[PDB]
Amino acid sequence: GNGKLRQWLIDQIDSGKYPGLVWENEEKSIFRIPWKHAGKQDYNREEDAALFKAWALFKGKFREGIDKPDPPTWKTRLRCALNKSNDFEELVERSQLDISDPYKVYRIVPEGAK
Amino acid sequence: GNGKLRQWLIDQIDSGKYPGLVWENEEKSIFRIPWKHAGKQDYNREEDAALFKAWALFKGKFREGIDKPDPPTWKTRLRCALNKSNDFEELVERSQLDISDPYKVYRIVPEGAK
DNA sequence: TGTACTTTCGGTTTCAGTTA
DNA sequence: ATAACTGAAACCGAAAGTAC
């Protein structure tokens, strides 16, 4: 019904517009989400916050030129959404937050099971 | 007929028993309703939830000593009631949630207009 | 059956407390 | 010596649910 996160995230991954946001199997049931710490020198605000920024735009919580950009908050929102969502589940021991290009790994729950 | 919220809240404001629950003009068409986030250290359940608790008793949705106290649910109920009420309108740009003693500002709609 | 709320849904925001 | 991060929980609006 009123759920937007499930299809939207799937769409972003399927789009391939976000390097590192990729499927891990061909069943398209496990996927990889870039998760770089915004304090690292490796961080580029445009690319590394692009997914969080997309979600903030899509949900109407940010408008270009009008609201001050705030990547940390964009990040917190999507993290917290993924945490509460019944549609997604982190495979915490497959996440690689400790590498040069870090990422969390998520499973997509079949529609019914809850 | 069976609408209870309008008179009840007006009565609460007139009662003066809820510090911060006050009229903003002498026509008694605009009022201030305290709206503190319960996560603050400044939060005291007895005083800051007293109105939300009162609405829960009046509507029979809580009994002291029997049901576990639950101010968040108390708050949600009154908020969702005000959201749907045709008797009240938040003056969202005069509400002050960003101050040490936060409050929302409400307008009372004249009885007829809808 | 329509009204006036209430509860639930699907995320959002804030907190105290970590971690980079 | 501080920005960013975090899970937990309070919070939110929309809208489905429901007691008259």
Swiss-Prot record, chains A, B:
Superkingdom of the source species: Eukaryota
Effect of residue 79 to W: In IMD131; likely pathogenic; loss of DNA-binding transcription activator activity
Residue ranges: DNA binding: 2-110
Reported tissue expression: Lymphoid cells.
Induction: Not induced by interferons.
Modification after translation, per record: Phosphorylation by ROCK2 regulates IL-17 and IL-21 production.
Compartments, as annotated in UniProt: Nucleus; Cytoplasm
Outcome (variant: residue 76 to R): In IMD131; pathogenic; the orthologous mutation in knockin mice recapitulates the patient phenotype; affects DNA-binding transcription activator activity; the mutant is able to bind GATA-containing sequences that are not recognized by the wild type and is able to activate transcription from such non-canonical sequences; results in decreased transcription activation from a reporter construct containing canonical ISRE; increased nuclear localization; increased DNA binding
Job of this protein: Transcriptional activator. Binds to the interferon-stimulated response element (ISRE) of the MHC class I promoter. Binds the immunoglobulin lambda light chain enhancer, together with PU.1. Probably plays a role in ISRE-targeted signal transduction mechanisms specific to lymphoid cells. Involved in CD8(+) dendritic cell differentiation by forming a complex with the BATF-JUNB heterodimer in immune cells, leading to recognition of AICE sequence (5'-TGAnTCA/GAAA-3'), an immune-specific regulatory element, followed by cooperative binding of BATF and IRF4 and activation of genes.
Reported disease: Multiple myeloma: A malignant tumor of plasma cells usually arising in the bone marrow and characterized by diffuse involvement of the skeletal system, hyperglobulinemia, Bence-Jones proteinuria and anemia. Complications of multiple myeloma are bone pain, hypercalcemia, renal failure and spinal cord compression. The aberrant antibodies that are produced lead to impaired humoral immunity and patients have a high prevalence of infection. Amyloidosis may develop in some patients. Immunodeficiency 131: An immunologic disorder characterized by recurrent infections, including infections with opportunistic pathogens, and low IgM, IgG, and IgA serum levels, low plasma cell counts and abnormal T-cell subsets. IMD131 inheritance can be autosomal dominant or autosomal recessive.
Subunit record text: Interacts with the BATF-JUNB heterodimer. Interacts with BATF (via bZIP domain); the interaction is direct. Interacts with SPIB. Interacts with DEF6. Directly interacts with NLRP3 in the nucleus of Th2 cells; this interaction enhances IRF4 ability to bind to the IL4 promoter and is required for optimal IRF4-dependent IL4 transcription. Interacts with SPI1.
Family: Belongs to the IRF family.
Protein's name in the database: Interferon regulatory factor 4
Source organism per UniProt: Homo sapiens (Human)
Stretch of the intact protein here: 20 to 133 of 451
